[PDB]
Each structure stands twice: as structure tokens, then as C-alpha cells.
Amino acid sequence: ASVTQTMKGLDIQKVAGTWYSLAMAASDISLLDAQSAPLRVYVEELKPTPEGDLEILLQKWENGECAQKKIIAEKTKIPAVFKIDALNENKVLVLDTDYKKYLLFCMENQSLACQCLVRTPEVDDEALEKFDKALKALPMHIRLSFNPTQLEEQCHI
Amino acid sequence: ASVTQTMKGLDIQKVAGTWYSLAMAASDISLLDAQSAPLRVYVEELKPTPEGDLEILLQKWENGECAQKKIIAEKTKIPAVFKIDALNENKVLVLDTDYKKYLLFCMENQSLACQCLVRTPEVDDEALEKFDKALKALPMHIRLSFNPTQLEEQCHI
Ligand SMILES: CCCCCCCCCCCCCC(=O)O
Ligand SMILES: CCCCCCCCCCCCCC(=O)O
Secondary structure (H helix, E strand, O other), rough: OOOOOOOOOHHHHHHHHEEEEEEEEEEEEOOOOOOOOOOOOOOEEEEOOOOEEEEEEEEEEOEEEEEEEEEEEEEEOOEEEEOOOOOOOEEEEEEEOOHHHHHHHHEOOOOEEEEEEEEOOOOOOHHHHHHHHHHHHHOOOOEEOOOOOHEEEEEEE | OOOOOOOOOHHHHHHHOOOEEEEEEEEEHOOOOOOOOOOOOOEEEEEEEEEEEEEEEEEEOOOOEEEEEEEEEEEEOOOOOEEEEEOEEEEEEEEEEEEEEEEEEEEEEOEEEEEEEHHHHHOHHHHHHHHHHHHHHHOEEEEEEHHHHHHOHHHHH
């Protein structure tokens, strides 16, 4: 269940800028089933702070409407692991990224969701291979992927 | 998009009896998202009629409740292809089965959903491999799998 793959030698400054949530998977179906499931979040932009923390802009459907949400991930001892304040303190692990095209990540509390991010609104078969193979290891029960048209809309409608 | 894998030399009498919908995937996320999505159907039992048609018992969530539904699939020229009466006349294709453990199928109208069925409430990694690899070919955007506990409940709650 635990995630035991992280990016060796991650430079968090190089993941700054725009991303698309091409695909997402989670351990429990109810975390992603509906448009307003808890972890159905669409990534807009990564903004690393100078002090090394990560700021995230994303979209989340709630109250029948697509909201913008800004969120702050705090660094830890490990460069590929970050921390998000909540009801219960969640972890974000960076699995892999080539900076220029794709980045794979997971978040944990036991529950768990992961995502394949890409720089452009295109179906990258390669990044998807890598995403599937990192997931093989994990106990997933729901997976979503989206098309180029959907990737350009708010909340992937 | 089209399904171009079918079981060679299918004997429809040998798939009679009990099955579990271990996993399901579809081309559009809305066909499977909610408990009452159109193609979120859980297979209970296969009953082949003497004249070669297939009778299916299944469970479908609707009106906030888990209903039993009986359904009838009519044979065609091809042993692995069957036909279900509806608003629009749908096809059911049998991709693969070893009769004793697993059976993979898809249904078509363009929309498309497939399933990995198994005889017992157990996670069969093998049948899942075969399911993933038959799906590789197809344009899927939502996938669900269920655990042994869920497999014994009505509507996989
Ligand atoms: C390094 C890139 C990681 C991107 C992580 C995105 C953060 C997702 C947190 C999801 C928690 C729900 C958001 C909320 O509504 O508060
Ligand atoms: C050979 C085994 C094939 C099993 C096929 C199951 C039939 C699924 C039909 C789904 C259509 C919706 C059912 C309904 O509510 O009318």
C-alpha cells in the first residue's frame, strides 16, 4: 500500500509553471467517483516558493460550481516529500518527472491517490506507461483519464 | 475503438452459472461514475437457453435501491457475438474465457464498456493482466475494480 518510489535528486524549482492532470487513480472508488469527490482535483499551476515550499493552484468542483483553490505544500527533510495541512496531515510524494513533459505524484494519509501530470493538452502514451507501472505496485480501484478537449476546460467538463 | 478480439470456438453452454464482476471499464467516465451510472451493472448469473440464446441476471442500482434485473441476449451468426434489445440495438462480444475461472466481455453501440468476470470472490491477478492487455487496444477513460468483501454484497456496496 505504502508508496516507495520517489524521484532521486528532485529540483523543485524546475517543476514550476503549468501542468495538466492527464490521469488520476485512487485506492477507494468514492474518492474519485463524482465531479465533487474529495480528491477529484485538477492541477492548474505549480509555484515553488524561494524558501523551498510548493504553492499549488487547482480547480475543484463544489456547490454545483467549478472553484479555483490555492494550496500550500510545506517541505520536509526529503526533497521529494511535502506536507499539506488538513483535518489530518497529508503527505505528497513526487515519484518521477523529466521536468519538460511529465510528472507523477501521489498523496497519502489507509487512503491514497496519484496523478499523471503533463505540460501540454496531449495524450502522452509514454508518461501513461510509467504511470501504470508505478501503480502496478499499489492497491488502486479507480482510474480516470481525460481527452485533449476536456483538458482545456474548467474542471475537465 | 471497435472491438476486434473475440473468443475462437466459444461454447456458450460452458459459461453457465455464477460469475462476479471483478472489474469494469468504459470509454466515457459518465457511464460508470456513480452507483446509478447507465452501465454500472453487476453480473449475478449466466443461463444459456437450449436454443442458444443467453439469459442474464444482474444487479443495477436505481431509485436509491439495488434492483434485480433479468435480461436476454439473442445469438447472431457469430458464436461470440450476441444482441440485446434496447432504445438502440447493442452488441455483446465475448473476448476470452477459460470457462472454469474467468471470462472477458465488452458491449457496444461510439460508446463501449467491458468487464472481467470470475467464478469466485477472489482477486485473480492473471485474469486482470488479460483484461488490461485487451483494453490497451481500446480508448478507455474509466476503470473500476472491487475487493472480496465488496464482491459478496448486493451492488458491491
Ligand atoms: C508536486 C505536485 C503535487 C500536486 C498536489 C496537489 C494537491 C492536492 C491536494 C488535494 C486535497 C484536496 C484539496 C482541497 O479541496 O482542499
Ligand atoms: C456473455 C456475458 C455478457 C454479460 C452482459 C451483461 C449485460 C449488460 C447490459 C447492460 C445494459 C443495461 C442493463 C439495463 O439496465 O437494462
